[PDB]
């Protein structure tokens, strides 16, 4: 349960789509996965079988990011129509729609306590909402450009967001500001508790983030300094994430390659020819041996992990 690395070829090619795919995630409990899109559709697939289950229409513009509740019964999606729509996995119907963002929303995530929703749009603000009634509670300011991704911590108290302002701000419900970037930072991955011993051997909580600077760099929120710099990407990095066991680093970029990294030696071991065009997002199953990558060529592919 540690040697799980994606291997060629694709197990299943979920090509039942018509528009580019932006985000893909795994269900924490059930054996399904969902996928956002550009044509205001969220489609649920069965990654074990490869069969299309259902679609969740109701957005009026391109869906940017999607995230699940801890229990897996609640789904939150953000789109380009300035809305944070809320979905449940009991009857698969829209529960509430939250307005209040001045432009395109690019990120969303359920708080680990399962009561608040974080969001990040182009208007350089971070909004916190209530899952019970859709009423905003707090707003966060300190960015001056497009905010791409926001990712909470494992306790619901630390919130990290990346923007086009060459910064990765951290807020406590600002703890730190990191301004040693050289281009726009795009994606944020949080370090789980199963990697502290591994990184102490190699070198909390820790923050890892890719960017459009052809490299990945990682800091410490307790000190605000870069630990190790991971370089070698041939194009813009779109998505990064930690391995479930906390030993490997999974990332994707526009070079159509999945490079699996490690902080023991900071080098690439195998690049996977995933799609014929750019790769937008990917996810790693916490227990099952499966990797799914969401790409911008209107295809979703699932990789076996051996």
């Amino acid at each position: 349960p540690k040697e799980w690395i994606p291997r060629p070829p694709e197990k299943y090619a979920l090509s039942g789509h018509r528009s580019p795919v932006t985000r893909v995630i795994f269900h924490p409990v059930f054996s399904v996965m969902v996928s956002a899109s550009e044509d205001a559709t969220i489609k649920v697939w069965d990654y074990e079988t490869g069969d299309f289950e259902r679609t969740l229409k109701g957005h009026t513009d391109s869906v940017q990011d999607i995230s699940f509740d801890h229990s897996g019964k609640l789904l939150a999606s953000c789109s380009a129509d300035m809305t944070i729509k809320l979905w449940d996995f009991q009857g698969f119907e829209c529960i509430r729609t939250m307005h209040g963002h001045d432009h395109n929303v690019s990120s969303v995530a359920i708080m680990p306590n399962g009561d608040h929703i974080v969001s990040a749009s182009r208007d350089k603000t971070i909004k916190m909402w209530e899952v019970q009634t859709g009423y905003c509670v707090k707003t966060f300011t300190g960015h001056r450009e497009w905010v791409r991704m926001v990712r909470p911590n494992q306790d619901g108290t630390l919130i990290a967001s990346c923007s086009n302002d060459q910064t990765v701000r951290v807020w406590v419900v600002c703890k730190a500001e990191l301004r040693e970037h050289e281009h726009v930072v795009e994606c944020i991955s949080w370090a789980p508790e199963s990697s502290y011993s591994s990184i102490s051997e190699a070198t909390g909580p820790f923050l890892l983030s890719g960017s459009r600077d052809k490299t990945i760099k990682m800091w410490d929120v307790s000190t605000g300094m870069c630990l190790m710099t991971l370089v070698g990407h041939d194009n813009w990095v779109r998505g990064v994430l930690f391995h479930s066991g906390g030993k490997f680093i999974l990332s994707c970029a526009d070079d159509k390659t999945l490079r699996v990294w490690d902080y023991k030696n900071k080098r690439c071991m195998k690049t996977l020819n995933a799609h014929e065009h750019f790769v937008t997002s990917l996810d790693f199953h916490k227990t099952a041996p499966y990797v799914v990558t969401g790409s911008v060529d209107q295809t979703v592919k699932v990789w076996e992990c051996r």
């Binding site: 205001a40 229409k57 109701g58 957005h59 009026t60 513009d61 129509d81």
Partner: protein, 48 residues
């Protein structure tokens, strides 16, 4: 919501058509410039 989505997609095509018209205007400008260059070269050659 479906009607609003169809209207919102419809305006993007108008924006793309505007951009295509502008780029075709730039193309015809540079093509007219090189055509005038060729005509001037031909007239100079005939004068020679």
């Amino acid at each position: 919501e479906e009607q609003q989505m169809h209207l919102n997609v419809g305006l993007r095509k108008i924006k793309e058509t505007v951009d295509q018209v502008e780029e075709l205007r730039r193309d015809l400008r540079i093509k007219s410039q090189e055509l005038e260059v060729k005509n001037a070269a031909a007239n100079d050659k005939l004068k020679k």
